Every structure is written in structure tokens, then in C-alpha cells.
Amino acid sequence: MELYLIRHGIAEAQKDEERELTQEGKQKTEKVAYRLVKLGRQFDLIVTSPLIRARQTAEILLASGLSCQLEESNHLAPNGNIFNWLDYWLKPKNFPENAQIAIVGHEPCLSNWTEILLWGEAKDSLVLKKAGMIGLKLPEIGSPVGRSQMFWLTPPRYLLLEH
Amino acid sequence: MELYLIRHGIAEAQIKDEERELTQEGKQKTEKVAYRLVKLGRQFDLIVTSPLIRARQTAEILLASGLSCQLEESNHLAPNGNIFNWLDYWLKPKNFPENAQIAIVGHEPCLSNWTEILLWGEAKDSLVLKKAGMIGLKLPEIGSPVGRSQMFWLTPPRYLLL
Ligand SMILES: [Cl-]
Ligand SMILES: [Cl-]
Known part of the structure; x- marks a missing residue:
């Protein structure tokens, strides 16, 4: 499924x-x-x-x-x-593989949750601007921790017609 | 400085x-x-x-x-x-200004793994970099960028269109 962090x-x-x-x-x-x-x-x-x-x-x-x-x-x-969110919210939801879900939150929460899903632990190596977004693909089976992939990361400025 | 991997x-x-x-x-x-x-x-x-x-x-x-x-x-x-030889025999020599913006045109998984090394210190295969896709990194002007850099952009061609 696809997870979007905004x-x-x-x-x-x-x-x-x-x-x-x-x-x-x-x-x-x-x-x-x-x-x-x-x-x-x-x-x-x-x-x-x-x-x-x-x-x-x-x-x-x-x-x-x-x-x-x-x-x-x-x-x-x-x-x-993230661990409670994964076990008490995401897992129970049982979203289909074609699901597209967006979550709107704060820093460094979003970037850290992303690093945990990609790398396995927070690292504070991502720059997520306000109104900025990250797009992740999470596995259908098993925990997505350290097994997810990132296909999108962008700040608002690069979404405008010119900058 | 800023690194743009394409x-x-x-x-x-x-053949x-x-x-x-x-x-x-x-x-x-x-x-x-x-x-x-x-x-x-x-x-x-x-x-x-x-x-x-x-x-x-x-x-x-x-x-x-x-x-x-x-x-x-x-x-x-x-x-x-x-990555290590590139950093010592190419990047370091250039001695670019902390305000420099360099573009690198390469292949996968080199670009993605190099990025992971610069961000986390080791490759992980967690990033999806499409052809003509791009990654934007920020390297500290002090010390080694290995496991000390920051990513601020990652996009495939399709999301670059209007
Ligand atoms: Cl911005
Ligand atoms: Cl594309």
C-alpha cells in the first residue's frame, strides 16, 4: 500500500x-x-x-x-x-494492497517514522518542509519496519509552476 | 553544498x-x-x-x-x-564552496545506495529511483558526509510534470 506523510x-x-x-x-x-x-x-x-x-x-x-x-x-x-500506530491502528485497518492513505502530522515525527520504516530507526537525515510530503510503499505482509521504500519526497517549492 | 543525483x-x-x-x-x-x-x-x-x-x-x-x-x-x-574513492579522489579535490550545487548522472543501485550511505552510513535498498528521476542531497561543509548528510528531495519524472 501507499503511505503519504504530509x-x-x-x-x-x-x-x-x-x-x-x-x-x-x-x-x-x-x-x-x-x-x-x-x-x-x-x-x-x-x-x-x-x-x-x-x-x-x-x-x-x-x-x-x-x-x-x-x-x-x-x-x-x-x-x-509509530509502534502503537502500527499495531493498534494500521494493522487492524487491514488496508488492501492498492490502498492510498495520507497522514498529516509534525516534525520530527513524520521524518523519523519514515526512517524507521525505511532504515529501521530514526536518523534525522530527511528534510520535510511544512506542507511538504513523502510517499512510501509499505509491504502487504509482515511488519513494514525496515522493509518499506520511498518513491517521493518533496517540498512545496518544487511543486509550483516556477521557482 | 548540494548534491543532485540523476x-x-x-x-x-x-551488444x-x-x-x-x-x-x-x-x-x-x-x-x-x-x-x-x-x-x-x-x-x-x-x-x-x-x-x-x-x-x-x-x-x-x-x-x-x-x-x-x-x-x-x-x-x-x-x-x-x-563511493569512497569518488569522495577522496574527486569530490574532496574539487573543494567546492559550501554553496555549490553539483549534478551527478549515474546508474542504480549506485545512486540510491550512495545516498543511503551518505544519509545512514550504509546501503539499505529502501529508495526507488526511476530513470531520469532525481535525488537532492545536502552535504555538511565540515567533516565527512558519510552518514552525516541530509536528503531534501526525491522524485520520479512523472511528478515533475504540471
Ligand atoms: Cl518550500
Ligand atoms: Cl516516472
């Missing part, structure tokens, strides 16, 4: 859990969603961290038509952990 | 496989990518390619697109080269 868009400065997306944050995120739809991308489901920042990013993705289903999961919060 | 474009199917050249669609696709890279304001101080025809033809298309003015080639980028 970092929330630019939010206001300084609880931080309530910081909302700023004007440029919404604009940039909208541009990303538009380009994705233009490319013909779609997600069966979008799962988001409960923090406002993420939820608002997820809403923009939905409004663009990228998906029609939304779910919030505490696993995606800054204090969540 | 796998060669589509070539003929399996000597080292002489296999790009296909009509391979040249086209690569041109689209090059032109796209231009619009994305991408500039390369130098384009270093593998001696094999597949790579060189892909590197020439990138050079022609105006992506760069210099085109050099090293055997280290050949299917049988090793």
Missing part, C-alpha cells in the same frame, strides 16, 4: 496546540493540494493529528478533492509513537 | 549493455525533465556523468537545456565504482 502548513508563532495556519500557510498548502489534484493524486483516507495546525491542513486537502474521508488520530500528535 | 534516461533493452543508448522516448522524457528543472530555477556549477552512453547522453541533454555550462565525467560513477 507535514502541516505554516502556522502562527507564539498552548502551541492551538496555533492556527497563517495566510501564507493556507495559500501554500492550497497550492500543494491543487498541484496534487492536477497530477491526478487521491487518497482513500486522510488521517490527521488533532492539533489545529494539522487539522486545518487536512481540511484544505479535502476541499481540493484529494479525498472524501477524514479521521483524527492521537497517534499523529507530537507525543505519539 | 539516474540516466530510458535506453534500449538488453555490450554499456553501449546501449537512449531510446526516442528516453531522449524526449529527459528533455522534459531538463526543461522542468530550468523552470524550477535549478542551476548546476557542473554536471558529472558516468562514461556509459546511457549516462553521457542524459548528461548532454541536461547540459544543452542550459542547466549548466560544464560537463565532466568520472569512472567512479560507472556501475563498478565505489
Whole structure:
């Protein structure tokens, strides 16, 4: 199956859990969603961290038509952990091989979860910008830990018509 | 500095496989990518390619697109080269500025594994790099880049289109 990891868009400065997306944050995120739809991308489901920042990013993705289903999961919060998400969320879901799922979260959570899925442990070697995305292919059978593959990693700027 | 690893474009199917050249669609696709890279304001101080025809033809298309003015080639980028010799006898010597942006045109799994070595210190075979696909890395201006670099971009040709 395909897992897409999207970092929330630019939010206001300084609880931080309530910081909302700023004007440029919404604009940039909208541009990303538009380009994705233009490319013909779609997600069966979008799962988001409960923090406002993420939820608002997820809403923009939905409004663009990228998906029609939304779910919030505490696993995606800054204090969540991939192992519980894998065993108590992903595995039970029993998604088909052709599934395309997007998760909207935070750093360094997303990059680390990615390194764990690719390498087997966090390494902090990936640069994931706000409204940026990572595309991974996870195995159907067995744990995806250290057995996944990355086919996409991009910041918002490289999704624009010119830069 | 920044490192841009580009796998060669589509070539003929399996004479000597080292002489296999790009296909009509391979040249086209690569041109689209090059032109796209231009619009994305991408500039390369130098384009270093593998001696094999597949790579060189892909590197020439990138050079022609105006992506760069210099085109050099090293055997280290050949299917049988090793990252460590390339780093000591090519990269280190060049002594590029911390603001340099170099493009490398090579083959798989060399490019993907070299990236993994630079990011994690060892190859893992976890990255998918398509032909004419590209990977963007950031190397620290201090110390060895082995297991100390950062990746900020990885995309296949299809996601580069509008
Ligand atoms: Cl960006
Ligand atoms: Cl492609």
C-alpha cells in the first residue's frame, strides 16, 4: 500500500496546540493540494493529528478533492509513537494492497517514522518542509519496519509552476 | 553544498549493455525533465556523468537545456565504482564552496545506495529511483558526509510534470 506523510502548513508563532495556519500557510498548502489534484493524486483516507495546525491542513486537502474521508488520530500528535500506530491502528485497518492513505502530522515525527520504516530507526537525515510530503510503499505482509521504500519526497517549492 | 543525483534516461533493452543508448522516448522524457528543472530555477556549477552512453547522453541533454555550462565525467560513477574513492579522489579535490550545487548522472543501485550511505552510513535498498528521476542531497561543509548528510528531495519524472 501507499503511505503519504504530509507535514502541516505554516502556522502562527507564539498552548502551541492551538496555533492556527497563517495566510501564507493556507495559500501554500492550497497550492500543494491543487498541484496534487492536477497530477491526478487521491487518497482513500486522510488521517490527521488533532492539533489545529494539522487539522486545518487536512481540511484544505479535502476541499481540493484529494479525498472524501477524514479521521483524527492521537497517534499523529507530537507525543505519539509509530509502534502503537502500527499495531493498534494500521494493522487492524487491514488496508488492501492498492490502498492510498495520507497522514498529516509534525516534525520530527513524520521524518523519523519514515526512517524507521525505511532504515529501521530514526536518523534525522530527511528534510520535510511544512506542507511538504513523502510517499512510501509499505509491504502487504509482515511488519513494514525496515522493509518499506520511498518513491517521493518533496517540498512545496518544487511543486509550483516556477521557482 | 548540494548534491543532485540523476539516474540516466530510458535506453534500449538488453551488444555490450554499456553501449546501449537512449531510446526516442528516453531522449524526449529527459528533455522534459531538463526543461522542468530550468523552470524550477535549478542551476548546476557542473554536471558529472558516468562514461556509459546511457549516462553521457542524459548528461548532454541536461547540459544543452542550459542547466549548466560544464560537463565532466568520472569512472567512479560507472556501475563498478565505489563511493569512497569518488569522495577522496574527486569530490574532496574539487573543494567546492559550501554553496555549490553539483549534478551527478549515474546508474542504480549506485545512486540510491550512495545516498543511503551518505544519509545512514550504509546501503539499505529502501529508495526507488526511476530513470531520469532525481535525488537532492545536502552535504555538511565540515567533516565527512558519510552518514552525516541530509536528503531534501526525491522524485520520479512523472511528478515533475504540471
Ligand atoms: Cl518550500
Ligand atoms: Cl516516472
